[PDB]
């Protein structure tokens, strides 16, 4: 029957394909004069079009490399498939899966970026034997391990450093009894080495210095630590933990103007044989974005080990910087050993995907599948995992129109890992019968048009099936009463020829279709997220709605909790719509008048254990309820680090338990073993 293919582009084979992914073209010269040449494949066949003459390419995704994932990190593969040859047609999409999986016992590197300003003097004393003690614990998590050390204060220049009296330049602790080192921006100390004992040897040789302002040049350190590959000695196939201990703020780009420094940070390594950041006094601090780029490229997981006073600051930095984690350091850094162990397990709890070098013409959509088979659309991240677990992501790649450049490529990659999936894209927009074209053909009125794919493409002036008439009586409208060519063209040779326009192109059998009359959002046609086609916006892969301004993403909708919009709340266009009565916030995380978890949400000893109540015939029993059911028996902490309570069970007995929050959020139950009943 009638469709988008027939009643639009019936001029050439290429236009036909550009109309829609479902349009096929028939080049058979024997085709009855009248039947639609551009139609669905099924319809062309029903008019006995020669199968080999049918032009109908289909988009595909051929897997080139498909090495299975490794079971033990002892070459290791953590991303499968590794390479895929994608091939798309005009305005068409294609989906494909990727499987990320963190191998167990993968090698680990640990560089220790340490603030060594005056307040961190006591921190050196408590770190004296870290390294060997760090090894002992790390040997459980990995078989291969190398560790290194770095140190930093701030840019050695006024007003960051004291410059009087002349003795102060030799010893910043001049007015104090003790004597400390001259000020340094950042110095490398110990290259990543297998000898853990040498770390301890070097830490005792270190000492602090002093400076004026509270903020520090830690981001200068972090930059150099990242970009100086060969000096630090990061392994290619290994986890890269960068431990950043500090007890104060950090300087950002544009702060250097106060020290007369404006030259922007170049993201280059400037630490020669003397192991000092030489450009400290001449170049500005790095910006947040420039540092984040290098962290990503070098697959570094930056750990913010900072004191409580300044935790919220660095936690807010970790929000912007992917692959990072924060750890509450004590004022003497006496708990750093455990902080790293916890950070490693936390960093590896999450698997986030990052796209790299994606061409403008392409757009991507993600659906995530984490633990169980709970598919979460619009998500490219899974959390609450353990080392060894495996997950998969469904990725869709749509193209807009048809790019001139015939071949393009990009890389989907997990954050902080070397392994990746390279996607080679190819655009198939041309018909095969174009190659066998025939210009100035005898078939088109003694060379007044090119004959390709069973049709005359007439040159300027002439129209018709063989380019007969030039200028000198047929239906140029749907009905008799309706006007001619929608007053947008001229019915010349029984065929609408549309007028030109300053805004774009006017097409169609009756010049009814436009290319620039679509709806605008903010001075942007289809919100700049879709191509205009006959008045209607065709949105890209990751945008929906009549305006193409509602994202498919649900990254911003999820919270630290685990589920989308904390508890209840429909995610819409990257923003939650809170349903739970009385709940509010960005992710519906805030709810003062919610019935406390220790009341209604006690179904974890009801739905699963001793099955009873709701969620029996509906798939949501252990969806919300998925906490750690630890069977501890009356610990000495009856209501302090959580929200404990008790209720009356089925047989009139008390049941004691506790779960709420320790630091940020810990969903771990502590229900008792044996109940205590009553006779009457």
């Amino acid at each position: 029957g009638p469709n988008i293919c027939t009643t639009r582009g019936v001029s050439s084979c290429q236009q036909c394909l550009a109309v829609s992914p479902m349009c096929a073209w028939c080049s058979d010269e024997a085709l009855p004069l009248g039947s639609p040449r551009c139609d669905l494949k099924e319809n062309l066949l029903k008019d006995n079009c020669a199968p080999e003459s049918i032009e109908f390419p289909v988009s595909e995704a051929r897997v080139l490399e498909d090495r299975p994932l490794s079971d033990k990190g002892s070459q290791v593969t953590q991303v499968s498939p590794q390479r895929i040859a994608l091939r798309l047609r005009p305005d068409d999409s294609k989906n494909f899966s990727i499987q990320v999986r963190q191998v167990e016992d993968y090698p680990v590197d640990i560089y220790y970026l340490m603030d060594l300003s005056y307040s961190m003097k006591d921190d050196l004393w408590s770190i004296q034997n870290l390294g060997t003690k760090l090894a002992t614990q790390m040997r459980k998590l990995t078989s291969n391990l190398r560790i290194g050390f770095g140190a930093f204060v701030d840019k050695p220049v006024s007003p960051y450093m004291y410059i009087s009296p002349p003795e102060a330049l030799e010893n910043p602790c001049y007015d104090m009894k003790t004597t400390c080192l001259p000020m340094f921006g950042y110095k490398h100390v110990l290259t990543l080495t297998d000898q853990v004992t040498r770390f301890n040897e070097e830490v005792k040789k270190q000492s602090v210095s002093r400076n004026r302002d509270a903020p520090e040049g830690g981001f200068d350190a972090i930059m150099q630590a990242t970009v100086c590959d060969e000096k630090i000695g990061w392994r290619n196939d290994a986890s890269h933990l960068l431990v950043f201990t500090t007890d104060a703020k950090t300087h950002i780009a544009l702060d250097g103007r106060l020290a007369g420094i404006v030259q922007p940070n170049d993201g280059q390594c400037h630490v020669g044989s003397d192991n000092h950041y030489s450009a400290s006094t001449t170049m500005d601090y790095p910006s947040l974005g420039l540092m984040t780029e290098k962290l990503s490229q070098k697959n570094i997981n930056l750990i913010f080990a900072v004191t409580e006073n300044v935790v919220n600051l660095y936690q807010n930095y970790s929000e912007l910087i992917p692959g990072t984690t924060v750890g509450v350091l004590s004022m003497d850094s006496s708990n750093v050993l455990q902080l790293i162990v916890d950070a490693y397990g936390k960093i590896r709890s999450k698997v986030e995907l990052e796209v790299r070098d994606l061409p403008e013409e392409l757009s991507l959509s993600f659906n995530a599948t984490c633990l169980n088979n709970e598919v979460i659309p619009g998500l490219k991240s899974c959390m609450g995992l353990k080392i060894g677990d495996t997950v998969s992501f469904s990725i869709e790649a749509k193209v807009r129109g048809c790019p001139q450049e015939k071949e393009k490529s990009f890389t989907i990659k997990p954050v902080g890992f070397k392994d990746s999936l390279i996607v080679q894209v190819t655009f198939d927009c041309d018909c095969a019968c174009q190659a066998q074209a025939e210009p100035n053909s005898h078939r088109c009125n003694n060379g007044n048009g090119t004959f390709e794919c069973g049709v005359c493409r007439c040159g300027p002036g002439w129209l018709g099936s063989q380019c007969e008439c030039s200028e000198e009586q047929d239906e140029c409208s749907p009905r008799e009463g309706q006007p001619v060519c929608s007053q947008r063209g001229e019915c010349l040779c029984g065929q609408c020829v549309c007028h030109s326009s300053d805004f774009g192109k006017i097409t169609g059998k009756y010049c009814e279709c436009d290319d620039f009359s679509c709806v605008r959002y903010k001075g942007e046609m289809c919100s700049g997220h879709g191509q205009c086609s006959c008045g209607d916006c065709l949105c890209d892969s990751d945008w929906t709605g009549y305006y193409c301004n509602c994202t498919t993403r649900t990254d911003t909708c999820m919270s630290s909790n685990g589920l989308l919009c904390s508890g209840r709340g429909k995610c819409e266009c990257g923003s939650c719509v809170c349903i739970q009565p009385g709940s509010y916030g960005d992710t519906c995380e805030k709810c003062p008048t919610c019935p406390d978890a220790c009341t209604f949400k006690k179904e974890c000893v009801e739905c699963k254990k001793f099955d009873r109540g709701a969620l029996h015939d509906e798939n949501t029993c252990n969806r919300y309820c998925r906490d750690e059911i630890e069977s501890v028996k009356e610990l000495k902490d009856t209501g302090k680090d959580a929200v404990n309570c008790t209720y009356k069970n089925e047989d009139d007995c008390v049941v004691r338990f506790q779960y709420y929050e320790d630091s940020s959020g810990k969903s771990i139950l502590y229900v008792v073993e044996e109940p205590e009943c009553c006779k009457g």
């Binding site: 007003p159 004291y162 302002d213 950002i252 974005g289 600051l313 994606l358 001229e490 008048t593």
Partner: protein, 913 residues
């Protein structure tokens, strides 16, 4: 829009001097405009960087400039036990420059300074300093308000309070029209930041050579703080002045603190006594919101508007979560004492690491269209990264989202093209303000000149219908009767300082839409389908009209009689002569098309006279004040007369209304509508038919979003009419719709107990909390909200509950009666409720509550065991009750219903063994 990008003027300074780090226009007493340019690494006398200041005179060719002489020697003066020392090495003279009247002010932010006294010292610190100069007299002066003579020991004893040692005064600078030099010193008060103000006249008169430490009586500085939010905020990283309080006598300061509140960033507006009027918070951490500030009235209503720069602002991208580009924020100043709300516009850079918004320059009215314009700088913008400067023109609603002109850096990589900018000044006296752009990395300054803007007007007048059967002309020379008709075309050209010898070409095309050899009408003289005219508009204040005569071809010579005959008029400037160099810029209406047609179905008089009818109504009529209303205009248009040519519906929108979408019942489904803001008011025009045939009747449904209009009144008026191009009876009657406006509010009260259930064992009993929450969801704001909570018992030894504490939040204040917690301290079912026993009524008050705003009160208590074990086998249920209401809503005419309601919280007690 009209800066000359080809004919630029380049001034250059010494290599490595950073010439063009700062700049400003300077006007001498005689009126001539010159350019002050700062070069903060110019070498001094002792072969060391001290900075320098040049004064470039205006030459079209540009070149090398002379320098202003300044004392670059170090001073040492012994006063009693103390020894004063100034250190000008790497002081950065010219790091900021600013002109006022016949005075130039150049500062050295990093000029160090120290005071020695026996063993002790005041520490060698960058206090900053400014040099003042009056070229024509040769007078000099200095200003350095952060110099003190307190020793290092005293600051330590007072926890570094009021510590001006690291000021770096002159980092930013600005001078008022009254002549008050305002210096920004972001390092002041231990890197909190401070401002130093003093009148220029007093700085000169107070100055004494050989006296390093002195005070300028009439100066005034900002204050210190113990608030953590301000620590390391660099308050005064930038500065500006304007009018934001209404009183023209006073002048208001605008200050940038780009790392305020843990690098969140902030911009504050203060009065002359440094009291905060507004504070604008940064959107994103580490974005350096407040790096740049500018003040100008962009929307042309008299009131100054504020622009803020955040050069390190990051946006999201497919392959980049943290895509640093930069962002500029626009805040329009509203009427009265209303606070500056959310940004009226957001401009965001497109190039990665471009630093869009590091400089923002008011340009004045660059194109003389009535609205002031700005220039924004991206020192590393453009695909190359070499740097860009984008111009944005002023409009009725603030600024255009898209730039009218983009200036690419003419210097090599790393020049920092656009790190400093100044406009608003006519340097070549042509009547249009110009732009100077610094590029300190290239040690140069570029100068762009504004070209005169010619506003073209075009008009085309022709008959609405042509009758072939009437032949009143004959083809020249021959005598072949032809149906002829006049065509008038009028072209005008306006603008300031446009050349007295100005001309334009005017091309006229008949039957444009038809092919070359299908043109149904031709000119009587040449018998061609078009001609070009050379109109002399030189000095002609009026537009020029010229009429020609066309004619319709023989009846049998063409078939198409229905299609309309389109006439077009295209106006352009002639080409430039050998050597190029175009003088003016031509904008406005330079192209226009009108049409005519052959007579058809107009009756025996061959003159179509329509009877256009229009009826209308509105659905969803009650417009909610402070809401996101979406009306739907339903209107039926009909013609009971003869054909109406170019028929179209014309809906005049009110101030708040915006066209969304339109539909019709024909089976054409969607209408071809075009919102025209050209008319004094916002008008929407949808095509009804060409022609709109006899007995044609179109129903139209149009969605219209009536946005936030707080000063609309009791109702808003819509006006609708059908228009046509016919000579007789062209338009329908004017239908007016008065949609009423009323404010509504919906406050919700919720409650719950914590815990819900509570079992008891065999000093203090178990705790219980009852928490109520209020939430204004509805559109309207509510004032005078009173909440009254009823709690059972009066915390007596005979009562069951003992009330510990009441914890209200969200600006809510409560008063219990009787008092709660009379002691010290930190923080069948028996129905125990306030109806049974005595009661503690807690009453609260809230003065105002905005949309989406919340407020909660938590009541803490615990059971009194002795009372509880009276009746040792009962099942208790503790009940509380809460009532609430609202006094009024702050609006013009809101006759609906004041919010009210009630809530109730239960807590059950259970028996355990």
């Amino acid at each position: 829009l009209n800066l000359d990008p080809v004919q630029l003027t380049f001034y250059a300074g010494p290599n490595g001097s950073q010439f063009g780090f700062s700049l400003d226009f300077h006007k001498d007493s005689h009126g001539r405009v010159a350019i002050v340019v700062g070069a903060p690494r110019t070498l001094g006398p002792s072969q060391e960087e001290t900075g320098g200041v040049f004064l470039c005179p205006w030459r079209a060719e540009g070149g090398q400039c002379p320098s202003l002489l300044f004392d670059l020697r170090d001073e040492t003066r012994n006063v009693g036990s103390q020894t004063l020392q100034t250190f000008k090495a790497r002081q950065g003279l010219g790091a900021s420059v600013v002109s006022w009247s016949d005075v130039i002010v150049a500062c050295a932010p990093w000029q160090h300074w120290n005071v020695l006294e026996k063993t002790e010292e005041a520490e060698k610190t960058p206090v900053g300093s400014c040099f003042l100069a009056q070229p024509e007299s040769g007078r000099r002066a200095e200003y350095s308000p952060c110099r003190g003579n307190t020793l290092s020991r005293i600051y330590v004893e007072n926890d570094f309070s009021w510590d001006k040692r690291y000021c770096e005064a002159g980092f930013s600078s600005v001078v008022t029209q009254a002549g008050e030099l305002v210096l920004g010193a972001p390092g002041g008060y231990y890197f909190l930041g401070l401002l130093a103000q003093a009148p220029v006249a007093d700085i000169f008169s107070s100055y004494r050579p050989g006296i390093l430490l002195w005070h300028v009586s009439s100066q005034s500085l900002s204050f210190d703080s113990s608030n953590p939010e301000y620590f390391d905020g660099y308050w005064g990283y930038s500065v500006a002045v304007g009018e934001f309080d209404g009183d023209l006598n006073t002048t208001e300061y605008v200050v940038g603190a780009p790392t305020w509140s843990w690098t969140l960033g902030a911009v504050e507006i203060l009065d002359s006594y440094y009291q905060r009027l507004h504070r604008l918070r940064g959107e994103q951490m580490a974005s350096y919101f407040g790096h740049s500030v500018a003040v100008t009235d962009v929307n042309g209503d008299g009131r100054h508007d504020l622009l803020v720069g955040a050069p390190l602002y990051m946006e999201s991208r497919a392959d980049r979560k943290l895509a640093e580009v930069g962002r500029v924020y626009l805040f329009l100043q509203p009427r009265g004492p209303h606070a500056l709300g959310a940004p009226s516009l957001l401009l965001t850079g497109t190039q990665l690491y471009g630093r869009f918004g590091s400089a923002i320059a008011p340009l004045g009215d660059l194109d003389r269209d009535g609205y002031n314009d700005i220039a924004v700088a991206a020192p590393y913008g453009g695909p190359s990264g070499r740097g860009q400067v984008l111009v944005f023109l002023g409009q009725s609603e603030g600024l255009r989202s898209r730039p009218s002109q983009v200036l690419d850096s003419p210097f090599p990589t790393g020049s920092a093209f656009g790190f400093s900018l100044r406009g608003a000044v006519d340097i070549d006296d042509n009547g249009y303000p110009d732009l100077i752009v610094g590029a300190y990395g290239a040690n140069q300054v570029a100068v762009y000149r504004a070209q005169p803007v010619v506003k073209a007007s075009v008009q085309l007048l022709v008959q609405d219908s042509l009758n072939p059967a009437v032949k009143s002309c004959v083809l020249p020379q021959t005598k072949t009767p032809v149906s002829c008709f006049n065509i008038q075309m009028c072209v005008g050209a306006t603008g300031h300082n446009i050349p007295q010898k100005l001309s334009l070409n005017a091309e006229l095309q008949l039957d444009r839409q038809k092919p070359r050899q299908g043109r149904r009408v031709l000119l009587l003289g040449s018998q061609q389908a078009g001609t070009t005219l050379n109109l002399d508009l030189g000095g002609k204040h009026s537009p020029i009209c010229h009429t020609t005569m066309a004619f319709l071809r023989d009846e049998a010579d063409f078939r198409d009689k229905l299609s309309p005959i389109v006439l077009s008029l295209n106006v352009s400037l002639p080409p430039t002569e050998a050597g190029m160099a175009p003088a003016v810029v031509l904008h406005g209406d330079t192209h226009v098309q009108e049409q005519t047609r052959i007579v058809l179905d107009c009756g025996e008089d061959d003159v179509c006279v329509p009877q256009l009818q229009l009826t209308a109504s509105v659905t969803g009529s009650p417009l909610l004040v402070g809401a996101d209303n979406v009306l739907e205009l339903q209107m039926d248009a009909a013609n009971e007369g003869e054909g109406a040519y170019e028929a179209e519906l014309a809906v005049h929108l009110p101030q708040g209304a915006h066209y969304m979408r339109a539909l019709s019942n024909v089976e054409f489904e969607r209408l071809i509508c075009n919102q025209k803001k050209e008319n004094e008011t916002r008008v929407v025009l949808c095509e009804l038919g060409n022609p709109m045939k006899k007995n044609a009747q179109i129903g139209i449904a149009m969605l219209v979003s009536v946005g936030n209009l707080e000063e609309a009144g009791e109702s808003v008026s819509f006006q609708l009419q059908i228009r046509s191009k016919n000579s007789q009876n062209p338009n329908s009657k004017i239908v007016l719709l008065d949609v009423p406006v009323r404010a509504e509010a919906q406050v919700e009260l919720r409650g719950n107990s914590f815990p819900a259930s509570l079992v008891v064992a065999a000093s203090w009993g178990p705790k219980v909390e009852h928490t109520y929450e209020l939430h204004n969801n509805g559109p309207g704001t509510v004032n005078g909200l009173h909440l009254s909570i009823h709690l059972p018992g009066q915390s007596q030894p005979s009562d069951l509950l003992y009330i510990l504490d009441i914890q209200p939040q969200g600006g809510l204040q409560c008063f219990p009666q009787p008092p709660v917690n009379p002691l010290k301290v930190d923080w069948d079912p028996v129905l125990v409720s306030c109806d049974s026993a005595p009661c503690t009524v807690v009453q609260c008050d809230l003065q105002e509550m905005a949309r989406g705003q919340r407020a909660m009160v938590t009541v803490l208590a615990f059971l009194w065991l002795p009372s509880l074990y009276q009746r040792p086998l009962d099942q208790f249920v503790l009940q509380s009750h809460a009532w609430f209401n609202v006094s009024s809503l702050p609006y013009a005419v809101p006759p609906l219903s004041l919010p009210r309601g009630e809530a109730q919280v239960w807590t059950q007690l259970l028996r355990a063994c």
